[PDB]
Design a protein around this nucleic acid. Sequence first.
RNA 1: CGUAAGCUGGAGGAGCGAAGAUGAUUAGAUACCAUUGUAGUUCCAGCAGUAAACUAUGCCGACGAUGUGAUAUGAUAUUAAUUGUAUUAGAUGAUAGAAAUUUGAGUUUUUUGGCUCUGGGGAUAGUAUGAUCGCAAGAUUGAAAAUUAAAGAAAUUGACGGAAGA
Lengths: 97, 127, 117, 63, 217, 197
Amino acid sequence: PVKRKNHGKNRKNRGSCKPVQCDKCGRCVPKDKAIKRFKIVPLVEAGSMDDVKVASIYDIFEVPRISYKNQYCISCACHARIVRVRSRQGRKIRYDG
Amino acid sequence: MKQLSNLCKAINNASRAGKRQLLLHESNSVTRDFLKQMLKHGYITKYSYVDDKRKGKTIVWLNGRLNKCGAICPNYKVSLDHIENYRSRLLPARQFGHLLFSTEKGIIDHNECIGSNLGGSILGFFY
Amino acid sequence: GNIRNRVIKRAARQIVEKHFLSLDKSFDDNLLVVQDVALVQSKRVRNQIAGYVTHLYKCILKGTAKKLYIKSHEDEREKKENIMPKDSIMDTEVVEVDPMTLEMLNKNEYRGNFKLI
Amino acid sequence: FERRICSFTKRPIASSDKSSVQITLADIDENGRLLNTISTYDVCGVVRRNGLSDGYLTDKIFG
Amino acid sequence: EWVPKTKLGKLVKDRKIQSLDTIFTHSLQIREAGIVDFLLGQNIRDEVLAIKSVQKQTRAGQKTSIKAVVAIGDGKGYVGIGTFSSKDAATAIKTAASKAKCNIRPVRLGLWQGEMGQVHTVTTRASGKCGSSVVKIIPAPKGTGISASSVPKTILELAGVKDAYTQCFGATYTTENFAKATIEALEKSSSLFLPSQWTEPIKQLNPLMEFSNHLNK
Amino acid sequence: IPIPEDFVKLILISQGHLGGIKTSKHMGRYVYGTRKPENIKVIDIEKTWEKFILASRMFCSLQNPSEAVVVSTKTFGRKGVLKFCEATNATPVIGRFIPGTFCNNQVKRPLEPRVLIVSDPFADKQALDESSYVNLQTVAFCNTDNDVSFVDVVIPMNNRSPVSISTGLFILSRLVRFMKTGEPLDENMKEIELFIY
RNA sequence: CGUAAGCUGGAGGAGCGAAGAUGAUUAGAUACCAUUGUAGUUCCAGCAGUAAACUAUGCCGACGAUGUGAUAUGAUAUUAAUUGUAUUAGAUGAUAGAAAUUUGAGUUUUUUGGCUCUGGGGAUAGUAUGAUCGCAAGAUUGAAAAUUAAAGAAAUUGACGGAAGA
Ligand SMILES: [Mg+2]
Ligand SMILES: [Mg+2]
Ligand SMILES: [Mg+2]
Ligand SMILES: [Mg+2]
Ligand SMILES: [Mg+2]
Ligand SMILES: [Zn+2]
């Protein structure tokens, strides 16, 4: 039988896409059939937030943050519990940001 | 007969859903003699058709008495002795139903084809 | 013990229907009445029934006990709410009408006195 | 073997039609009164499900 | 005995409704088996068609049930079929006979040709399909008799048709779907709109509205 | 034909002619126009009076008015239907509609009605769903955005505000009283307080 | 015309890397792990013609229910909107189907608008033989003797997981 409506990925009216590579294993995966997450972490820890204040030569300053984008194949992704098995009737829910 | 089959399929969709009227974007001299035979026996109400230096249009008003109308392709040459064979195939009962034959006298019923002893090419059926 | 059985609760709900009027606010007099109207085998289950009856009857008088209808308590409660206000909403003479809704009232030729915002 | 004919689509109505209802209206004279006469209409089961049954009835009575 | 729990059955016990014909034309659904029994006594003809055992697996063993089909019938034009499944084979047939009385229906009869004569044959051709089985009923001249298989001939003897021609298409070795298709085949022939039905019938009132004052008081 | 007198002050106060943002395909002719700033449609108060006559015409000539059921699920709707039921001798059903009260015969309160009335069609689906099984006539007060399946008479009103729903019961209480007994309608305007809180 | 390999000729070679050789694990590993390492993958000129080359749905033509979107563009209108044509995504009903599913896979036993190609129980078998292509590897066409009562598709109830959550 068929499992999903779009078969593995969300690609329509095209023929092909160039492949990208996973970070953990390193196998080639097409760019549509990938799992991508986004998270922003600061340079300093919150546990070390007060201790820089007594060592600052400056009066006031801002702590900066950096962003990251990650890519995975679906074998690596389910193994690290990024994406989990869901119910059959509950598979059709889509959480857009 | 692209125009004749395109007429009959639009009627079966319309008469089943229960609509009142219908508008088609092609008119033809075969279709006009078809409806006059349908008008004579009393299956539909009045109809009309418009010429506009183009394919033409056709407008018909129904009353809800049609079961199925149809057309046959290709148009077979039938002799006089085989009208009794075709009538058993395409009709539910002996008491009613109709056939249209493209005889040289005109498009007439199978009752007039037997009564005047003329066999010709077959067109379609309605009841 | 701390959670009542469904046999206890069902048998307690019936005695509120037929025998509502002989109930009271205090717990100890409800122990007497169940010995007249109920046939109970044991002693320990009997004290749970009369203690549950004062739970329902007190929660009728002030609380919201769903899925239970008694004809006697609801009648006098509506009599407190059958009072009439001295002033209704219909005392106002001026009605607020939108400039879109003005054209309907003129089209049908109605006799109300309409004033805009 | 008799069959009821719907007044709206002019077709016979089946025996096992679970949605066919006979709508009953009393006849009312001018100025509003009661008269002891009942006029009825019949509907089919398919016409009610689509939601066409209301617009037929307004044009049937008031015009 | 029988007690009229349904309000519709109380009228037939009090002899308000005389026959079945006001029920079928006014399309009142029946929900008790006692209504057809009081209306029709000792003219009920019945049989069974097939009996099969189904078996469902669980952890330790396999729970086994028995399924049976029953056709109910008059002499002239009333046929119903119901099914039931139970643990006991004795009570499997008894409840299934009652459900077949709730599913009863009438059938139209006509002639082969002409206008005058006793009705013997189904009027027009029809076709019934229920789950990969198609049954087709063709009208016949008089004096032919019924020409069909083992099962659907026994149904048509209950309906009262003297003579008809039959064919089959598809898997007929499951007798459950083979019986359900001839029901649709008999219904589809009776639902055709004829030119003899062009005349306007008389409007009437529902019999529940007429005897409403007798029922409540 | 009877004439609506001073009921226009009741509906224009109670916002019964107010509608929704969008209209369904079958509502149609009941919209006269829309507001410009808030884009809210209006309902013609003329044609709503026509359905008020017609719904009373179907409700009358019943030999026993006890064979008529009213349903309501809204919490504010309890007070208004109970004032309506006593004057018209109808059996009221309040709260969650139990499935099987028309078809199943093992429920605690079985009932075999002839005419069914619904306050809100979307809020009460199971009553209309069970009216498709047994042959019944249905009356419904519907907004501009509602489906009209299994309903033959529609009285278009505003069904979101609780104050407006008591008005349609109030006008219906006079007409059945007017059609049965020859009386002047609008006797006391102050009797709307028993319907509202 | 035709991804990817694979062939002859000349240019180039950073990283990656079949074949080959070493270190651990193992009863045994010439496999998974790790370190090296050649052809290749890059450019130009030509042969070759196979893929789960899949939307597993040939091409043309008439009619079809509401709601939210997307690309292009025209009219009304004017800073506030609702509207035309051609494609396209999704949800709810309705039909059809053995079922999963479904604006066609619908308008069908009440079977017909026109035209090309393919299949007939499994296995032997895409195997032999002949013919036509190609530098070669190989490609297209394509049987039988002897055998066998099953092979298979969709879906319910259990049991199991060196499967996942509360
Ligand atoms: Mg591809
Ligand atoms: Mg080439
Ligand atoms: Mg191939
Ligand atoms: Mg292919
Ligand atoms: Mg292709
Ligand atoms: Zn990976």
